[PDB]
């Protein structure tokens, strides 16, 4: 592999590296919209969340913090934004 | 690598390229400042201000929204703490090891770690006394350290 | 080798590898020079001429002459063009 | 604990040209190492290089041409006077016909042949041949 | 054509005979009211790109550049309607301060207003509605460097033809040539 064009990598090779060590670094996180079942309030909870996020009015539990990426509590409506 | 352990861990946050606020955060610099002004008065510290408005408000970084740091808008009208936050937690952690080490004299593992914790205080205490955060006559005394923690 | 008088004072000029640009020595007996007979367009047969490419033995022993001689077939219009 | 970044940059180029590679990646960039590379690109040892501008310290990808023998560094930035320069030449150049000790003068990062066209002794920064 | 929308720090007034009038006139765009009454521009240049393809530029006061961002596409469409054959951009007057040296009590030059941070800040408001997702400054084997700017392709659909007039205005204002690319999403 003497001639890997290491300034224009494929996005397949770019995806499956670390979030450091890339040609230009970028995070694996995102922000996600969560419809809790029973309200208008879309919450804008972070993907790798760390706190127990609660809803404003329908104040049941929304997500659970775990190892890397937050286990959502209820099977609830959901979309990745931006 | 890791200072007082033989670790070479590569695990730290990785900010994106685009510094601008995304097109969905309809939340101005005025509102995120006054939210921080509220919940810093609820016993919080700037390392745990930005974690909850990342997780429950979508603010990826305050310095991309207000153009300012969280400890810096706290100090901007005086309601930042006296000790720095990273100095506070090492002094609190040193008190807990030293209270452990009284009842357990034969715990030589805790005796070894206590001089490594106490060194990281004084290596970081000498930093803030040259950046004029701390008074020059500030000294870490273990006998009065239990009053620096609440 | 072009003295100040402007003359060739040199026994010969050595070849150099078309992969790694380094000199093939006088007794590097793993260095190949091989021909690729190109074909004319309309009838697809051997037209008489060819192209030569020299691969030095140090880059041939390392195991990427096939990566090499494809890549300098890539630059020279023989391969696929995709 | 990267005490010198010119030393690390030039070591990585030197490992890859003897490996046979056509491109390197120089992970921290500085203006001392882009003016180092635009002394050997102009003399013709490397080719097109891109600076990959990021918001922390940038990266550099260099196209290795193959004409490079060794691109070492003198890591204590010794000071060289123009009386002292000729004995730095015959210690760490292979010949007098080719190769350059590149050294930082008050008027810019130069050659040794360019530096004595002017009269501007400096600090020896590295060498390449 | 009036002393309202164009003030200066200084006197001179050449080539604003309709240019300040052009945004004095217009009626019922979105945010008609908070633009025509209190905001203002500083200067204007008429420079050339390509062949006979001029591009009038707006020099902007810095504190209300942020107040020009949310109206910019709905002022380009009216100003290129009126000034047809012509492109419209918004650049701040950012005022380089010189690097001190060996050669009274000047407190230190803020790095927000140094030449490197200005000549970068001139980019992302020149290419305003499509931001910058990368930069690949490349030197062309001859000492001459070249800035390759990657735009977003989240807002490609207003910038397809402006890339040669962006490069022309950025070469006159700064002194260094560029080119733009539209790379795939990551």
From Swiss-Prot, chain A:
The keyword Transferase does not apply. One of its GO terms (molecular function) is DNA binding. InterPro entries: Ribosomal_eS27 (IPR000592), Ribosomal_eS27_Zn-bd_dom_sf (IPR023407), Ribosomal_zn-bd (IPR011332). It is found in: Cytoplasm; Nucleus, Nucleolus. Gene3D superfamilies: Zn-binding ribosomal proteins. Component of the small ribosomal subunit. The ribosome is a large ribonucleoprotein complex responsible for the synthesis of proteins in the cell. Required for proper rRNA processing and maturation of 18S rRNAs. Part of the small subunit (SSU) processome, first precursor of the small eukaryotic ribosomal subunit. This is Small ribosomal subunit protein eS27. It comes from Homo sapiens.
Swiss-Prot record, chain B:
The modification N6-succinyllysine is found at residues 26, 33. The keyword Cytoplasm applies. GO terms for molecular function: mRNA 5'-UTR binding; mRNA binding; RNA binding; small ribosomal subunit rRNA binding; structural constituent of ribosome. GO terms for biological process: cytoplasmic translation; negative regulation of RNA splicing; ribosomal small subunit biogenesis; translation. The modification Phosphotyrosine is found at residue 37. Ubiquitinated at Lys-26 by RNF14 and RNF25 in response to ribosome collisions (ribosome stalling). The modification Phosphoserine is found at residue 29. The modification N6-acetyllysine is found at residue 26. SUPFAM superfamilies: S15/NS1 RNA-binding domain. There is a cross-link at residue 26 (Glycyl lysine isopeptide (Lys-Gly) (interchain with G-Cter in ubiquitin)). It is found in: Cytoplasm; Nucleus, Nucleolus. Transmembrane segments: none annotated. PANTHER family: RIBOSOMAL PROTEIN S15P/S13E (PTHR11885), SMALL RIBOSOMAL SUBUNIT PROTEIN US15 (PTHR11885:SF6). Component of the small ribosomal subunit. The ribosome is a large ribonucleoprotein complex responsible for the synthesis of proteins in the cell. Part of the small subunit (SSU) processome, first precursor of the small eukaryotic ribosomal subunit. During the assembly of the SSU processome in the nucleolus, many ribosome biogenesis factors, an RNA chaperone and ribosomal proteins associate with the nascent pre-rRNA and work in concert to generate RNA folding, modifications, rearrangements and cleavage as well as targeted degradation of pre-ribosomal RNA by the RNA exosome. This is Small ribosomal subunit protein uS15. It comes from Homo sapiens (Human). The lineage of its organism: Eukaryota, Metazoa, Chordata, Craniata, Vertebrata.
From Swiss-Prot, chain C:
The modification N6-acetyllysine is found at residue 81. GO terms for cellular component: cytoplasm; cytosol; cytosolic ribosome; cytosolic small ribosomal subunit; endoplasmic reticulum; nucleoplasm; rough endoplasmic reticulum; small ribosomal subunit. The keyword Ribonucleoprotein applies. Belongs to the eukaryotic ribosomal protein eS21 family. Keywords: Acetylation, Cytoplasm, Endoplasmic reticulum, Isopeptide bond, Ribonucleoprotein, Ribosomal protein, Ubl conjugation. It holds the Pfam family Ribosomal_S21e. This is Small ribosomal subunit protein eS21. The keyword Aminoacyl-tRNA synthetase does not apply. GO terms for biological process: cytoplasmic translation; endonucleolytic cleavage in ITS1 to separate SSU-rRNA from 5.8S rRNA and LSU-rRNA from tricistronic rRNA transcript (SSU-rRNA, 5.8S rRNA, LSU-rRNA); endonucleolytic cleavage to generate mature 3'-end of SSU-rRNA from (SSU-rRNA, 5.8S rRNA, LSU-rRNA); translation. Component of the 40S small ribosomal subunit. There is a cross-link at residue 41 (Glycyl lysine isopeptide (Lys-Gly) (interchain with G-Cter in SUMO2)). The gene is RPS21. The modification N-acetylmethionine is found at residue 1. It is found in: Cytoplasm, Cytosol; Cytoplasm; Rough endoplasmic reticulum. GO terms for molecular function: RNA binding; structural constituent of ribosome. Component of the small ribosomal subunit. The ribosome is a large ribonucleoprotein complex responsible for the synthesis of proteins in the cell. Disulfide bonds: none annotated.
Swiss-Prot record, chain D:
It holds the Pfam family Ribosomal_S8. GO terms for molecular function: RNA binding; structural constituent of ribosome. It is found in: Cytoplasm; Nucleus, Nucleolus. The modification N6-succinyllysine is found at residue 87. Keywords: Cytoplasm, Diamond-Blackfan anemia, Nucleus, Ribonucleoprotein, Ribosomal protein. Its main location: cytoplasm. Signal peptide: none annotated. One of its GO terms (cellular component) is cytosolic small ribosomal subunit. One of its GO terms (biological process) is positive regulation of cell cycle. Component of the small ribosomal subunit. Part of the small subunit (SSU) processome, first precursor of the small eukaryotic ribosomal subunit. During the assembly of the SSU processome in the nucleolus, many ribosome biogenesis factors, an RNA chaperone and ribosomal proteins associate with the nascent pre-rRNA and work in concert to generate RNA folding, modifications, rearrangements and cleavage as well as targeted degradation of pre-ribosomal RNA by the RNA exosome. Required for proper erythropoiesis. Component of the 40S ribosomal subunit. Part of the small subunit (SSU) processome, composed of more than 70 proteins and the RNA chaperone small nucleolar RNA (snoRNA) U3. PANTHER family: 40S RIBOSOMAL PROTEIN S15A (PTHR11758). NCBIfam families: PRK04034.1. Belongs to the universal ribosomal protein uS8 family. This is Small ribosomal subunit protein uS8. It comes from Homo sapiens.
């Amino acid at each position: 592999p003497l001639a890997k064009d290491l300034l224009h990598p494929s996005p397949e090779e770019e995806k499956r590296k670390h979030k450091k060590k890339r040609l230009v670094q970028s995070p694996n996180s995102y922000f996600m919209d969560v419809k809790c079942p029973g309200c208008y309030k879309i919450t804008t909870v972070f993907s790798h969340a760390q706190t127990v996020v609660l809803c404003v009015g329908c104040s049941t539990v929304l997500c659970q913090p775990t190892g890397g990426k937050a286990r959502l509590t209820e099977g609830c409506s959901f979309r990745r934004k931006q | 690598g890791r200072m007082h352990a033989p670790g070479k861990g590569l695990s730290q946050s990785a900010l994106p390229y685009r510094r601008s606020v995304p097109t969905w955060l309809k939340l101005t610099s005025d509102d995120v400042k006054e939210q921080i002004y509220k919940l810093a008065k609820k016993g919080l510290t700037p390392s745990q201000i930005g974690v909850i408005l990342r997780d429950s408000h979508g603010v990826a970084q305050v310095r991309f929204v207000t153009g300012n740091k969280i400890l810096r808008i706290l100090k901007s009208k005086g309601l930042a703490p006296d000790l720095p936050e990273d100095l506070y937690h090492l002094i609190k952690k040193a008190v807990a090891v030293r209270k452990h080490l009284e009842r357990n004299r034969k715990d030589k593992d805790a005796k070894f770690r206590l001089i490594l914790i106490e060194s990281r205080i004084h290596r970081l205490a000498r930093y803030y006394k040259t950046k004029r955060v701390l008074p020059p006559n500030w000294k870490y005394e273990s006998s009065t350290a239990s009053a620096l923690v609440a | 080798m072009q003295n100040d008088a402007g003359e060739f004072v040199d026994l010969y000029v050595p070849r150099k590898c078309s992969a790694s640009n380094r000199i093939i020595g006088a007794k590097d007996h793993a260095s190949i020079q091989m021909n690729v007979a190109e074909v004319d367009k309309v009838t697809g047969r051997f037209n008489g001429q060819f192209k030569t490419y020299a691969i030095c033995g140090a880059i041939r022993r390392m195991g990427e002459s096939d990566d090499s001689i494809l890549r300098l077939a890539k630059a020279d219009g023989i391969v696929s063009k995709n | 604990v990267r005490m010198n970044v010119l030393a690390d940059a030039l070591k990585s180029i030197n490992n890859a040209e003897k490996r046979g590679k056509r491109q390197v990646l120089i992970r921290p960039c500085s203006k001392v190492i882009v003016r180092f590379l635009t002394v050997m690109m102009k003399h013709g040892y490397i080719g097109e290089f891109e600076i990959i501008d990021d918001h922390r310290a940038g990266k550099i990808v260099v196209n290795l041409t193959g004409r490079l023998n060794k691109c070492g560094v003198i890591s204590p930035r010794f000071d060289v006077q123009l009386k002292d320069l000729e004995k730095w030449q015959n210690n760490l150049l292979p010949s007098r016909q080719f190769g350059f000790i590149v050294l930082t003068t008050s008027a810019g990062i130069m050659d040794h042949e360019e530096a004595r066209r002017k009269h501007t002794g400096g600090k020896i920064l590295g060498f390449f041949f | 054509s009036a002393k309202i929308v164009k003030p200066n720090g200084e006197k001179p007034d050449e080539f604003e005979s309709g240019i300040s009038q052009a945004l004095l006139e217009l009626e019922m765009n979105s945010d008609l009211k908070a633009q025509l009454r209190e905001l203002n521009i500083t200067a204007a240049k008429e420079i050339e790109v390509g062949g006979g393809r001029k591009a009038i530029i707006i020099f902007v006061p810095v504190p209300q550049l942020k107040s020009f961002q949310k109206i910019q596409v709905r002022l380009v469409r009216e100003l290129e309607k009126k000034f047809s054959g012509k492109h419209v951009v918004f650049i701040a007057q950012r005022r380089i301060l010189p690097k001190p040296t060996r050669k009274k009590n000047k407190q230190k030059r803020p790095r927000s207003r140094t030449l490197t941070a200005v000549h970068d800040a001139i980019l992302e408001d020149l290419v305003f509605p499509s931001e910058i997702v990368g930069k690949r400054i490349r030197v062309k084997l001859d000492g001459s460097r070249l800035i390759k700017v990657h735009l977003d392709k989240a807002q490609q659909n207003n910038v397809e033809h402006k890339v040669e007039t962006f490069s022309g205005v950025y070469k006159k204002l700064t002194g260094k040539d560029v080119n733009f690319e539209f790379p795939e999403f990551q």
